[PDB]
Design a protein around this nucleic acid. Structure first.
Ligand SMILES: [Mg+2]
Lengths: 456, 252
RNA sequence: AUUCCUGUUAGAGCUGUUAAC
DNA sequence: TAACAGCTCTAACAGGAATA
């Protein structure tokens, strides 16, 4: 009477690296083979530029030196492999800035930071990049260091310094990696070196890794919303993030606002179909004008019937539409029994109803462990002892949870901003939420689309 | 295999009591009168009640009571899916039936029900399994105590019990938690709960869930559908039957 | 903000069910 | 439109580092 439907397990998504080498473990595969974009020359080199207060430029120099030189994992040695330096790992030089590519933040930055005005702090920080705007050919990624003295402007009610800076520097087409004292201070140095190096390569060129065996005829849409607290009511900022592997070798990962105002996360008919009209045009431009054969729309909340009508009217009958709601907080949780020492395997999904499934995007991963191979790795072990599944609710389902579960799971391992093994959420939802935060911070970003490297 | 935290509720229909009122009533009015009178009955407005007629007569005077008949919720799963009031009512009824004949404390945090180990009755025989499950390296642990670096804060092992409507089925969701005796000061036990829960991995959590099922149903989940009942000495009572084994599945 | 996502604290939105206005 | 209920989300912090 308690026996549910038989569960299934989606194998750990293989990651494509240099010259079609597949490895589930990102850092291990990166060290062994090199980035997927190392077969060709997306970056011929990774040139950095420095933007930091004149007292803190030694910190940027030091972290760049640690990027150059090898580092050994201290924490989470269960998973993290040895770091061999930027040149050795990425097969690409990490070019230190010249004096002309090393610009100091003005003292007005410090003044407005002590004044606690992040709105002017972001303006002054982007103004400090004025010399770098003319030299955009000389450097690839600007290294911005935010000292703890600016802590008063990092985050407060209605403002986000990171999102504001990345919004101001997105139309300028110069990628930025922001460094706080967190990266300098965290005791495990292989952690920070791996994360920063992968981020720098991804936004100084791109594609540290891709997904192995990924269909190019699919588009993945994730709609995520942010809330801006009005003095009278509230405003909802729903943004749409698309992922797809286009005909070109460059994996495509973009975001764009679904839009005047919204009072709930639920798109109207002419809003949902407008954003999907934008979406399949974006897919078509990267697919020589071919229509998607399958659309995966991921949402944090449920699809209204008007939303379903808009989705089904935005695409022809040839296109197969998958509307899926992702419920992060569920009552269900699972134990592995044979009780195993390690929890339920990652990729395990249990169908609840016809339209409901529990996907374990968190769990034990095998064949990724560095020390004592044969022992599973539970990435959130420090956080929780057992993984919390997510719930998938299908609003247009022909049958078969394997396709959507594999899509969602594979979509957890291409967050190049994520230093750990995976994410509990698909990158569609992750980047739609990040871009929703960015748009809610700065409204005037609605017209253009933006690639992940400008906001990761 | 995969063992969940969901115990099936095979009960399909429950009998309730209807009190027809001479004047319209609001659910807020009913719930505040509940708090004021503190009856030995469960009440919802849809006015449905489970328990004894005398308590309902205490709650509503004879002037405002027209008749008291019986309600038949034929499809409990469909009715609680349709009505959040029915969902809350049935969840509270199952909780009252569960924690009736047992020393387990009944607490509520936010709107989730918890079966909490009593500090006074911690050393009971029925709690030895929980002591073993939370013990270290095969010794006997503790399931109640004082927070290590807190002035007055207390802690106990609890299980959150939720009602879940999934398709046409009802589930009792059990989540082992650490209840903090002052609810509004539970944030002050963040580090204590974190350190206590840190190494409750798959094995320890399986043992803890087995111990909590044994505590809440007197028997391990083998061939059992123990029938719990709320207000057995009342005209309008609810008798639920819950499978003692949690929901589980083998892969294909 | 190299990261992760866990807790805490609140809130909002969706649905309903009543009472209505 | 005003409560009520449940479900599920974001927002804002704090917080520690992968079977001990
Ligand atoms: Mg980044």
């Amino acid at each position: 009477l308690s026996q549910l439907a038989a569960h299934s397990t989606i194998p750990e998504p293989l990651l494509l690296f240099k010259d079609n080498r597949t490895d589930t473990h990102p850092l291990r595969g990166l060290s062994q083979y090199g980035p997927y974009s190392a077969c060709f020359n997306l970056p011929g080199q990774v040139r950095l530029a420095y933007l930091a207060p004149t007292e803190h430029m030694r910190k940027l120099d030091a972290i760049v030196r640690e990027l150059q030189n090898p580092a050994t994992p201290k924490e989470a040695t269960n998973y993290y492999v040895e770091y061999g330096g930027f040149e050795k790992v990425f097969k690409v030089p990490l070019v230190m800035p010249q004096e002309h590519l090393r610009c100091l933040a003005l003292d007005e930055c410090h003044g407005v930071a002590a004044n606690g005005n992040g709105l002017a702090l972001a303006d002054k920080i982007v103004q400090s990049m004025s010399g770098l705007f003319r030299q955009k050919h000389a450097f690839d990624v600007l290294l911005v260091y935010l000292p703890a003295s600016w802590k008063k402007c990092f985050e407060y009610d209605g403002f986000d310094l990171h999102d504001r800076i990345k919004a101001k520097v997105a139309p300028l087409n110069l990628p930025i990696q922001i460094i706080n004292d967190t990266a300098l201070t965290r005791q495990c140095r292989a952690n920070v070196m791996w994360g920063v190096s992968v981020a720098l390569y991804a936004k100084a060129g791109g594609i540290p890794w891709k997904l192995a065996d990924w269909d190019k005829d699919e588009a993945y849409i994730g709609l995520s919303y942010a809330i801006k607290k009005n003095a009278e009511g509230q405003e909802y900022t729903t943004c749409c993030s698309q992922v797809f592997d286009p005909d070109g070798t460059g994996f495509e990962f973009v975001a764009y606002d679904t839009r005047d105002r919204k009072g709930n996360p639920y798109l109207s008919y002419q809003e949902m179909q407008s954003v999907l009209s934008k979406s399949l045009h974006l897919y078509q431009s990267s697919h020589n004008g071919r229509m998607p054969r399958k659309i995966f729309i991921h949402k944090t909340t449920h699809f209204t019937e008007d939303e379903i009508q808009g989705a089904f009217d935005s695409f022809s009958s040839s296109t197969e539409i998958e509307l899926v709601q992702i419920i992060q907080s569920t009552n269900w949780y699972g134990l592995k029994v044979d009780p195993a020492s390690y929890p339920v395997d990652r990729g395990l999904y249990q169908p609840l109803t016809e339209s409901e499934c529990l996907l374990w995007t968190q769990g034990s991963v095998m064949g990724v462990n560095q020390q004592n191979p044969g022992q599973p790795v539970f990435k959130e072990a420090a956080l929780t002892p057992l993984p919390n599944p997510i719930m998938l609710r299908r609003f247009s389902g022909n049958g078969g949870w394997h396709a959507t579960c594999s899509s969602i799971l594979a979509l957890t391992k291409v967050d190049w901003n994520n230093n750990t093994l995976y994410k509990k959420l698909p990158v569609t939802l992750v980047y739609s939420q990040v871009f929703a935060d960015v748009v809610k911070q700065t409204p005037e970003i609605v017209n253009e689309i933006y690639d992940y490297r400008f906001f990761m | 295999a995969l063992r969940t935290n969901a115990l099936p509720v095979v009960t399909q229909s429950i009998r309730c009591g209807v009190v027809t009122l001479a004047s319209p009533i609001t659910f807020s009015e009913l719930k505040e009168r509940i708090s004021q009178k503190s009856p030995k009955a469960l009440l919802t407005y849809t006015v449905l009640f489970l328990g004894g007629e005398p308590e309902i007569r205490k709650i509503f005077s004879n002037d405002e009571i027209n008749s008291i008949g019986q309600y038949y919720i034929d499809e409990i799963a469909q009715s609680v899916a349709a009505s959040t009031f029915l969902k809350s009512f049935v969840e509270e009824a199952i909780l009252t039936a569960l924690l009736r004949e047992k020393p387990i404390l009944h607490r509520v945090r936010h709107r989730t029900h918890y079966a909490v180990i009593p500090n006074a009755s911690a050393k009971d025989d029925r709690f030895l399994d929980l002591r073993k499950a939370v013990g270290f390296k095969g010794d006997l642990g503790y399931i109640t105590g004082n927070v290590t670096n807190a002035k007055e804060l207390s802690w106990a092992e609890a299980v959150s019990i939720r009602l879940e409507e999934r398709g046409g089925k009802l589930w009792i969701m059990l989540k082992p938690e650490i209840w903090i005796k002052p609810l509004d000061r539970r944030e002050e036990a963040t580090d204590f709960i974190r350190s206590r829960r840190r190494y409750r991995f798959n094995q320890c959590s399986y043992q803890i869930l087995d111990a909590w099922i044994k505590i809440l149903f007197g028997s391990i989940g083998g061939g059992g559908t123990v029938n719990i009942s709320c207000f057995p000495d009342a005209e309008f009572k609810a008798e639920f039957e819950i499978g003692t084994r949690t929901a589980f599945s083998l892969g294909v």
